[PDB]
């Protein structure tokens, strides 16, 4: 009957919701990694100063 | 913190090389005394070798 179609659309959209959250969460993990890369440059600059000392 | 720790390690390295620079020079003074003292015994050995030559006094 039509009940299966009603549930399938909600189930299909729910799966996309989890994928959207997972992709956004993955981007958050990537953003932290990218931010740490900028911090690593400061550590690299500090290391060069330590080498100069 | 790693940069601060590295600086502390470098600073202690400066103290380590400062002492060993002074210690090596300090042991240069000590080796000078023994070398000159060895000269005293080097000079003494030659003089005693001459004692046997003087058969009357020996």
Query: Using a CB cutoff of 8 Å and minimum separation of 24, what contacts does A42-50 make?
Result: A43/B2, A43/B3, A46/B3, A47/B3, A47/B6, A49/B3, A50/B3, A50/B6, A50/B7, A50/B10
Q: Does A43 touch chain B (CB under 8 A)?
A: yes
Tokens of A23: 């992709």
CA B15 – CA A45 distance, rounded (Å): 25
Method used to obtain the model: cryo-EM
CA–CA min distance B10, chain A (Å): 8
CA A49 – CA B6 distance, rounded (Å): 11
Q: Does B7 touch chain A (CB under 8 A)?
A: yes
Distances (CA, A) of A6 to A3, A17, A21, A49, B13: 5, 17, 23, 65, 74
Set of chain B residues whose Cβ sits within 8 Å of the Cβ of A43 = 2-3
Tokens of A40: 């690593």
Helix, strand, coil share of chain A (percent; to 5): 95, 0, 5
Distances (CA, A) of B35 to A22, A47, B48: 80, 47, 20
CA A46 – CA B33 distance, rounded (Å): 48
Q: Does B14 touch chain A (CB under 8 A)?
A: no
CA–CA min distance B21, chain A (Å): 19
Give SS3 for A9. helix
Alpha helices in chain B (DSSP H): 2-53
Q: HSE (CB half, 13 Å, CA atoms) of B12?
A: 5
Taking CA–CA distances from A47, the nearest residue in chain B reads: B3
Tokens of A43: 């550590």
Interhelix angle A2-52/B2-53, rounded to 10 degrees, is: 30
Is A43 in contact with B3 (Cβ distance < 8 A)? Answer: yes
Q: What are phi and psi of B55, to 5 degrees?
A: -60, -25
């Amino acid at each position: 009957n039509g009940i299966a179609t009603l549930l399938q659309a909600e189930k299909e959209a729910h799966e996309i919701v989890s994928k959207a959250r997972k992709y956004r969460q993955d981007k958050l993990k990537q953003a932290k990694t990218d931010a740490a890369k900028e911090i690593d440059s400061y550590k690299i600059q500090k290391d060069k100063e330590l080498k100069e000392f | 913190g790693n940069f601060k720790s590295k600086l502390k390690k470098a600073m202690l390295s400066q103290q380590i090389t400062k002492s060993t620079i002074a210690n090596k020079m300090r042991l240069k003074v000590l080796s000078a005394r023994e070398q000159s003292l060895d000269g005293i015994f080097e000079e003494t050995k030659e003089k005693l070798s001459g004692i046997a030559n003087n058969r009357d006094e020996y």
